[model samples]
Target: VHLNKTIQEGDNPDLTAERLTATFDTHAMAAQIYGGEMRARRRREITAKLAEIPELHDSMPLPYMTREEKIMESARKLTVLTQRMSEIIDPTDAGELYHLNNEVLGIEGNPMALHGVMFIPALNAQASDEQQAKWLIRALRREIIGTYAQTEMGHGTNLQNLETTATYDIGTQEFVLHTPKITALKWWPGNLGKSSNYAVVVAHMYIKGKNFGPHTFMVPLRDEKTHKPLPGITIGDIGPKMAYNIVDNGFLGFNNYRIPRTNLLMRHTKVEADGTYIKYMLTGQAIMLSYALNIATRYSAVRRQGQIDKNEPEVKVLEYQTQQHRLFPFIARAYAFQFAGAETVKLYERVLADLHALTSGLKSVVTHQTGEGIEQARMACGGHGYSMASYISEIYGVAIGMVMLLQLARYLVKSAALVKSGKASQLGPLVAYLGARSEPTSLIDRVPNGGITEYIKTFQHIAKRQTLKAANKFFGLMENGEKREIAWNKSSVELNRASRLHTRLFIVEAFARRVNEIGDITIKEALSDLLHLHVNYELLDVATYALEDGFMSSTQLDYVRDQLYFYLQKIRPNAVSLLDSWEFSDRELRSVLGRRDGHVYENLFKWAKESPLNKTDVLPSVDTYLKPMMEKA
Candidate 1:
């Protein structure tokens, strides 16, 4: 019931004006965006609970703190969180736990970041039943700390080159782990160096010099009781990188470290004292795009610029076509990517076959677009966007590495053959869109579900062409006696184009599929308006193939441009409320510009005054060097 925030007394009336003018039930919209009714309700309740605990609030503006101060502050906050956690959140509920951590820690990350996510999830995935019976309960209760240690000082995921090896000793009946080089040193395992006493380490396996591939072992870091490094173990924090310093991303090395062979995580596979091997979610990125938009879009509405005519009062930046154009289409894909992410999880959980191939493309495409979209939000905020105080940069600058993109292109090539081989009926569910037919010409001239259907066809047409051509280019290059790898490299641009277009069409379909089934009146219309902006903008962005082939006339291109402009106008009034529907709490967005009450002007000054640099008249540097030189002169 309380999902939405509207105009209130003492509010900045500019923000209030935007709020009052918004059409639709923002609360109902919250239900859709948050994934369901109970989640929306739970979020409101959790936020209220957090509000009542003043100690949970940031001790000060995060940007004011140094690296040492940041970790100590996060450690202090984590202490309070552990003391009060049982009272406020469901530990079993990942979403509520995520909110609790995000609101309190402000997402610079924390000492327990990898401990809780990767270590815990890895335990469930590979730790045997006996291992779980022995360790899972205590781990679940946070009685012990653990981190996933896979990356090395060199070549993360290049398993064959992993310098850390677990050589099974036949006589000792233990796995003797050794770091063979400086490159073998484990690095970037969150919490391994400081906060954790344990880690699930990935190291190469060898028995009698027989290589058995990379495997996971539960390795002890610190002695459990004394909390110091164990025999044959060396560990330390790897130091800070940018703003994510709160997490003690760390390094470790081993010199013939011995642990029982049973320590190997073995769910489906195992080893004797002789040695063995073993085996091993579809979420997070889309939620991030929404968060970035939540911070940036609300700020847009509250921001003011000069009026269209100088004679009038200033207007919110939300009214400008340029601003709307920059921000709105991505706003639509926030929903689009979100729906795609959710459906991917469904296909994943709903008996996970064919799931792996789908997500390679989905993750690659969505992640690339997500980063760009957040950057768009960053740029959309204009000058304030550059400030870390806006907090957008914290969300903006993270990277999702691109191995899966290579995998995505391979899958596209395979699906391309499936289509070209005349066995399109054998296509998997994810690639079925690749085989779908398109209109002889784009019916974008007329509206079908406000051009969603037509755009889906248009997008599929463009993607299928890219797929067919890339496969041809790749195969043709191979025929010219180039190695397949060389062919692959030469065809990289077309291969990437094919995957992106395929994924974009999937995003469009998922969004349209979700919105059209929506029963609520104003929610549907509001969504449809944003959805219109998405299709129009997306088609134009990738219209190159269609444009060059004479498949879409320039006149049709003009229609796309006009619709994009028209929908930006249509999406303008609803822009602020669209973002507000996500319901980010003030703590969740630690931004002066992105504050809820729309007092960025005064509060930004207030925030500046709170900086450590503002403690005095600021002549310390002058006294250190400049003043002495002037006095000497």
Candidate 2:
């Protein structure tokens, strides 16, 4: 009876029928997807409350707004949102705050985006107790807005070359923060233009004429009362770009801006009273991607196009093998990345644990996968996908900006060097596989039914083989008398391959591990099918690597392809429910095509009429030019 429920009013009948084919409880599946039932229930409660606040909704369709309007609107909404912070959800849960922001402010960015994501975290990690007491309290309470200023026009990933200088004076016990040149101006920080009055600025330290490396300092950018740029500080909005225009990404320059030496974040590094520099150098979502997948999967089920058999009604696009191929791997990836993200956060919270390697790897892998997934989602929706109404394009513009992939490549190369130097034993568990022995051949055939262990081994073998290959290539060049940097340059391509493969293997393993932990038989079975599809599709995608070394035969790849197609059909029946398991509210999705009710055509028409351009019969242009030109002709 549970599987035969009738379509409710306003629900798309096709999507309703598709949901009836679901074998597992959607609520239980949601519990698994969201970590636990309590968390899932909390999300639902939060969403329900968010929907009750009419002022929380966008003033107008975001697409209709110009860049200035968007920023103004975001700031206005931010004011309203902050006012209701305590009344809405848990005021202290970062995760709940993140969810609220994602649903409310969305990916267009917000005034406090950097404050919450970077500024506060930077302070917590690097600020001393006294500094936190002075600044963190005000920041958390929203008394003063702040941002993390690290990237400059000249240097982004390479912190060593940062041109901003903080020169310490023993007489005054102050640091003169200077921009030195145009390239040294801090750029690309969210809300640095107009909203934030404070920043945690990273600059090269110079004490007693000796240059130290880059360190963070808390620099006041604006007057607290007047909100005007402080003396010797040059700050302005960087203007618009592809997306995320709602945020005012800004540029800043300092002209010998003097601040007390104590303003330097002293939790890790400090400048003594005698101008002696004590040095300690420290380093430091896939969530949005899942949201994208949820939209795409649900839309595919609701959107029916051409027929598969041609004799029946036009079928849901989810039934197409090509569409499934384009999307299902990413669907699996959304789950994979979520689990991986959870594990990463746990590792990061542990004291003295080095998360740089794992985090860099996961960030790069997930971000790249997210970009690909968003693109696939956009393509899957056809013409409507290209429109602002779909929101996939905006998602794409925002998701692909992850510079973390560059950091991952750096970590991978460094890790390979460590493995070569016999420091492999010191590597963290997340990357210990880099030092493991590789098998001569994959035992993929032994796991014909897709046993998780064998699949893991195959992935391990692929990663190990690639890492060794890249390492050997670099070492060989150096052994042949090439300079170290030259050898590294020569082997860059192979090294990147190793990094991607190794990271992907880690993601796949994480997915398998999460699947193994599920206790519910029905949920386990459904997710297991996804895992099977994932491994088969992933291995086949990179089958050339195994085939090049004679580890996997062409026949095995053919078998993988067969499994992939089979799973596509296997997954079709529960496709709608699987997406529904995410429980994204219609307000959060912000897509006419991705509505829960699946009344896409009607909603799209209504949405079109709501556009400001359609508010009037638009005779201005006609009267101004077109009509005059026609009359002249």
Candidate 3:
């Protein structure tokens, strides 16, 4: 049984209600199967609630709303939703916590939708329960609005080398946080501009002659009652962005902001009363990033479009081979990320729970994969898909925000390099498959190796081989007296490609494994057909890797292409059923192409007629600009 079970029925008593309830229940289990639905539902419910609030009326029309309106509206909505959601679930339920967050933040389409998901989740995931207990409830209840303050103007993607510092004064028991340069001030934190009263500030801690790595601290930025800037805090909105214009990703200056020692989120790491720094959890940053990426990966596949059925003359956007070709591969990605992310979160949870297990290496690898995978999801959606109204746009904008997250990927790779160089103990069980823990032989045997697990293993092996080959090529060049920098640069493209290939392979396996778990016979059969189409499509898409690895001949590649073409035809009949399974509400989807009325053509025409360009007796541009310019020319 899946963990989630709700009545799913609403106030209505008609067949539509029954169908909707069944659909809702189907997706609840589907969230477990595909690892995408929970995130979507959370987003939907929050947005629905936001629509009910009169303060958010103007911002409700996301695709048409102005940037300023979107930003202000998102801030207000998140402030209310997040606070309420926190009260509804346990602080320890990280999945629900983050899901609620990603929904409320809604930055996938709107860049300004950052403060809640990126800022708040980071704080919640990294903060100690003690610290969270102190503020999490209040923040959830709208008593304290906070944002994660990191990514200075000068340092957006690299967190290790950030210039902001919090020097602890043992005598005063205060950490003097400062941004020593113009670029060092926190920039791109959603809600910091004019909305949040506090910030979960990240600053490099310098105490007792040793500089500790990046640590999170809760800092009050505004007056609690009046929402005015507090002393020593300089903060304002970062202004608009290209697509996610509504997000108020803002900037902040510490100006020697002071906070008590206890404010340092001591969940994974801590500072003693005597000023001695203590590290309890090694993979703090990795776990935080993993949590964020889980939300991103799931949203990417859940938010696409395709054809449904021929008779119905409509289709679910997710069912088109082109759409699936675009999305299913990412659905594959959602699996890899969830599996990988779940592992990392569990590893960190155990470390915190017992404080005895060593997870340093597990942390690094997870963070690297999460960052890389999340970015790919963002770029996959085309331009309009990148807007705030689409939600995928907000998904991308918010996921990419992690690039500045303590230089997480760079650190992970560097640590992996050290492990490869034998400088650190082989993380043993953890290092069996190039940092991936080995599966039990018995489990592998019982499942029959030719199934999805075997596919994953084969994919992993291919990725491993390619990466090792590239690593060796770089090392060989260095051994032959080539400069280290030159050899490294020469192999950069191949090395990066190897990384992506592994990630993509993980995605493929994840999608397949998930579809195999669906128990509903009909849904499973339908999904199996889609999965077959997906595999052929993906194999053909990346056939170059097969050719390079010598595992497949050009003839074999041609065969796979033919197979994909055949499945595309086969899948055309069930297109609507697959999309209908996504169960997007008309109000939430906000697409004329996907209206439930089944009158897309008419609706499109009606929609086009409402365009501002169509309102006039004659187009003003033609009279004032175009005709004048043509005549002059």
Candidate 4:
């Protein structure tokens, strides 16, 4: 359909390519225009709504607002957003996920990002059919708000050590969940303090004094009608930290809270009324973590921006090479994670669909590595990136928040350690492509000797060699009487290098795959320029690795550098097209420079003038400090 004239213009291959290129270029520009318009309309609508709400009068000057006032304003705005979210997209539409996230959730201010993305998805993926029928419908209807309760005050990254325990109570036919120590209390769950009445509580399961690792149980923390904490439940918000002030990341404790035997989330594992342990299935916790990472990874690509022409009256920050250099690699990364994450999801779906038959343990490995990659993307953006204004920071916080939520890193380490011990099958279909064979299988095959398949094989060889080299070094250090913790800490950097390279290779492969599908030569040529820019920029960005490994000669490195400059120059003309294809609505972007009508300067100045601090005719801070000092002198 895309190749047909109706999708674009021209029937001939060459003409079609040119037309497609022009079309996408125009579309990208149109997206910017439409995004700006949509943003303005949304602002006006929200502003009008705020004016109708008497409680929100004090919400404008947030830094000056009292905590109670801030919290109240947040709750009020959340209600407004929740009510209006459906108007933007159908809840059932998979592609609508991104729009639903940014528009209704307001990533900058909302803290419920984690609870909605992680806790909810985990429940859906891991919960039994009966559990879904009971809770999913209520959750979808907004009757019951939920949070994922996992990380405790004592420890976060190390999940196996968590002190909270859920013991089987045969006499009562219930799971008696308890926080034995102060540090065992659940901490850092969004919506747990004020918004949610229920939580998917992760605790060590014990039966007959034998531990059964960590498992999830549905626990109701509050009285249904009064919305007050039930007896034996001690809960409160953890207060603000660094960024994401609007979200109420909180703490919870249970003094032997009782839940029916059936409350155990058992899609992968179940429980019987007689206190018998029934492990119905097991893909472990990796699949659940992957879903959360997928959301963050995709959202990262959709939200990142770069600066362009700072001297211009209406500068596009995303247009700047430095900004692109900082962000585009991550964009490339996000795409890679999405592809990888998609594979994890499909694999998980298949396992569940097939009743957890095949025991492939790749999901856990991917989850932790992806978490690290996602975090790196966040750190690359700098401080404004940390601020809620950028939204990437929020996404990062919530995304990394999953490390503790699912204990992803711990799971990955365990899986890797197991593979090393020969207790599990070889690691492949995830990172090490050489595990099964010397050559990699091509998603697109055209004879194994050489071509695209060979390129894939080369990528796999490099990635596998790097990963095994790191793993071997770590194992050697441990064998030389080094402590596991010390060796792991020392080797983690190298491990991450492998992880990042492995991830990048996937991105390169995916980009190649997508590009090859382009039937139009003109459009393909423009995109090819950008793609080349991405590859050269990416390799150059990680040149230290190539240099250290001696894989890249000085001449090769120099060639890459020249190629980067050349591609950048080639892309200069098609800059507008690259952004246009993204198709962000104005309302969603909320940036003056990206406004429709291309009157960027006027809009920017108007926005700057409207800042609350600019309202005064004279600056009091300067007058009070400087004027008094001058007069006294």
Candidate 5:
């Protein structure tokens, strides 16, 4: 009864009642979602501790602030948070640090956003021991602020075309970085414009007359004391953007700026005193989507409108099947991606040798799906979703974009070629399915109890078929005398299809693997329900390939559709509790529609009243233009 009351005390009785119907313990589910009970409890404790520090809270509502104000406010809070970091939580834990930032910053972004995400990671990955001793220590200690400058004004995702040059000068033993054309200027590096005094700049390395692809160099852009751009370097903010404006994404140009040759990050790659280059090759999130789902799910439950029975009170939109279809799979996906993310992290640590293949596939698929999920969530909320008040649009901006997909697509095409060349056995476990045998037809109907194993087999078959089909098409085009590049361009559509299908299979398998490991019977049962919906829905979504190949009959697809709807109804009672298990604080979610208390109506009204537009009862525009227009009329 106590547990029931705890879950049921939100402002809306309907939401409260919905939460009370949950059969599984929310904490147990949270344990599964967060990796363990210890981690989940630590997350709660951290949030509670941070909530006590009023100074760490936002100085003003972010939406109401100008770009300059947003940046300043973020810097102020970042300072306060850093000063009290150790007292608030485990200062050494990156996970804890990430949660702290999400709670306090709320995705408007901060001054050191790239410093931790890109700059420091690059140093650890690319910098030599001596370079690490010289710069990494200072960077970690925050004595020097830094950013990653890679994307140029005209080139992104195409490293070979980058025009920024790092030419070696034999006499002085220095590298001269220069921008020969307007398009060669570095652009879109977070915090590079105003906050960071230094950057790990990626440029085309030239030794003598030879161009050696792209390499990273540590460059000092501004003086440490005065924060002024050093001679021969031009840097400033790139102006306002649609979202993430708090980050001063900037443009940089170099007029033959000189840096010591030792500044080049040379852990696995090197340059000799002579013109010769020695080379070694190395390879190198879903929380936002869940937040979006949380907002939309909560809003759907609270937002009452049209009724199924005209004689009764207006029903919550959640009571409708269309709304359920629109929102619930994403709820399932939030869980799917969380589980996949955990598995990806583990696999990454275990297989650093094959990091490139795994990360490229996982990152591309997860980000793409997350973006789609956020858009579905945004549209689920209708008009309010379009407004900044819901924060869904802002969440979408940060979560959904497409640059990683190209890399993954390229990898898929290359992996397919490798498989055809009999080197498939050399491929990593993640892409081993590429070389596996395909089924003549899906055996989805044979296994009992929804036949999850058959579903897995069916997904495998579809992925394998697509991959082979794409590969065959490419090879066929080549045999017909088409250039390899031309054949690749023509076959890219099929290659991307194969990549997405293959990644989805991995995600489904990861979810099932995690569910199978759960010891709590009730938690396992609940997640199993979601997993069932996930598999069937995802299979149905890509059923075209299966249908075309006669692997899945039309009847089986109908069964899948039936199962999806059934599970939707089955999971309805547990919807609120599932989202609540994530345990987002009001501070972190920062959406009136998504507040845990569920007192949305009065608060939304108050929020509107608090807007700067409402500060004056009558607008000055009326006095300036409307009065004169009325007189003229």
Candidate 6:
């Protein structure tokens, strides 16, 4: 009953051989990779449902469309998506809806993409009951499109520097919102340029020259009935990005825009009809790497280059050790981040309290590393990986661009003192390891499972030492009669080093912990191989710290290297199998090289044939412009 049947009668022979060689069932792995059972089931059902609906399919290959055509296609499918929503998916299931969107639109994204993404959730948490009575119902019902506008041209990370003003006019009970200068114009918010009619705008709340920090105001940017930009608002698309062009990605400014004082989204503590409000704040990068690895990993298995044996026919590109070194470790990280992403949700509530410090470093490291991994994935396939038909480029462009983090260094010092001054037990989960007394030597490779704890010990040793070093540097600079600001600035780089190390430790712990959680015999074994690759590669990758502090000897590092090289072969058989575990439909991926059947050259040529240029043997430009110029009259 439980056959490992990803096998089809006519799948590319190379792909078939790779799937057959897999050590465990991909279905069981799918259960483990996605949530245990319920989620994987719903994801499959949603994907299946979309396959039957022709209207939701792409009007044309997105790569072939201009920015105008791209926007048009996205909006059309979005319309069909919304109109048929009630009859299609369960109203309450966000997962089902997300999968349906992924299948239909791919990642070019659509208008109204951010409406439910941030707006409804923003309103539900912040809007007072009366305010909610008006907006929440309509927003929840998808009547009005919305976006969050917070980052201005002047500000991406520092909220304290925001320049847009929302001064309360007590006499008229209105808030006059103004962008004081070019730098104050809101920029870079998704769906803001042309799709959204309203925004949760964060402006500097000024009550008669009393400058409160940034506050949220529910400002209507366009007329709801006519869908026109409202008077006193200047807003439009900022132009296409090098990638992620499907989004309008706009610029916005306000010429003394007026809204009711009650429009300040807040809980019902009451603003007394004069003025008052409260505040609030808010990974796609991880999933992009997932999609990237899924594509590159599959292509690597199917693709062949020069022969490894030389006497025999060419081997899979995946069989090359250099390619495995480049991709297999990162393949493990895709798994690491997946488990990390899940634990992020599992411990979601614990996150809110420590978000400022924890997320800053986590975001910085995750974005940089995730971006690096995605690029490597693209490179693993050599040339075809660079093509849009491979679809890794779309993911690369979107992923390489987004995050917030850096305060963890300062936060690390605050907790670093806890360990230095003998109050280690009170440390937060993030900083708790700061109190850990690391082993004199990693004792890695000592036993079958000691490596996990020992490698983590080495990570903690690396993190804790960097934290203390930075803390000492900050204190010493202040001791030499420098300003705290200047001293902190000088210590910033060291602090980030600590922040990244701690975050890396957190990533490893999350992966190791998840591997132990599952009950399946084969699933556990398969992931354990990857986890071994992850810890060994990660520890050795950052082994300079291990070397500098003498927490790990050179031989200990070789042990890690040997295991990393050893597991590369271990993971090679499962490379395609692991990629398939995400269960991405061929439709969702939209890559010729990433096709399940592995008919790369055939489908790729067919995809080229569908290009509009292929319809005509000669282009009009060649006949008109080049012909006249070459005639030399």
12-77: candidate 2 lDDT, tens digit per residue: 887777788899887788778777888888888888898789898888778888888887888888
Clash count per candidate: 0, 0, 27, 18, 0, 1
Write model 3 residue lDDT over 1-633, tens digit each, in one string.
211131133312221222232322445544543247766565455546645554423344455555666556665665565445544444566555543444344333333244445655766788787777778877665577667877889987656978899999998999899999998989877667877787888889999868887888889888887878988888887766655555556789978888899888888888887898767121222222333232222232234344365467443343455543443333333333444444445555665411112132223333454455444434444453343323444433434432221232233244356557865554433323555533422122234443445445545655656656667777788899999889877766666655555445544554575567667666556556666665565556655655565655566566557766666656444433334444344444454433433434455476656654566767887998999999999
Q: Give the least accurate 10-residue stretch of model 1, judged by summed lDDT.
A: 274-283
Compute the lDDT of residue 233 as modeled in candidate 1: 94
Candidate 4 stretches with Cα past 4 Å from truth are 1-88, 109-116, 119-133, 260-262, 266-274, 280-462, 475-490, 544-550, 596-600, 614-633
Candidate 2 RMSD to the real structure: 3.2
- Predicted structure with the largest lDDT when compared to the true one: 5
Question: Global lDDT for candidate 6?
Answer: 0.81
lDDT of 4 by residue, 149-252 (tens): 88899887567989999999888888899999999989888878877888898999988788998998889988899999999899999987765566778799
Ranking by lDDT: 5, 6, 1, 2, 4, 3
Q: Write down the TM-score of every candidate.
A: 0.95, 0.93, 0.67, 0.68, 0.94, 0.95
Off by over 4 Å in 6: 1-4, 274-283, 350-356, 446-450
Candidate 4 local accuracy as lDDT? 0.56
Expressed as tens digits, the lDDT of each residue in 412-510 for candidate 1 is: 888778887887898888777777776677777855454478787888888888888888999899989999998999999888788777777778888
Question: Which candidate, 3 or 4, would have the higher lDDT against the true structure?
Answer: 4
Model 5 is weakest, by summed lDDT over 10 consecutive residues, at: 276-285
Model 5 misplaced stretches (Cα beyond 4 Å) = 1-10, 269-284, 352-355, 402-428
Candidate 6 lDDT tens digits, 431-487: 787888776777787656645777777788888888998898988999998899999
lDDT of each: 0.81, 0.80, 0.55, 0.56, 0.83, 0.81
Candidate 4 minimal-lDDT segment of 10 residues: 280-289
Instruction: Show model 2 residue runs off by greater than 4 Å.
Output: 1-8, 278-284, 349-355, 402-428, 431-440, 446-450
Q: Whole-model lDDT for model 5 versus the true structure? A: 0.83
With a 3 Å backbone cut-off (N, CA, C), the pairs that clash in candidate 6 are: 360-405
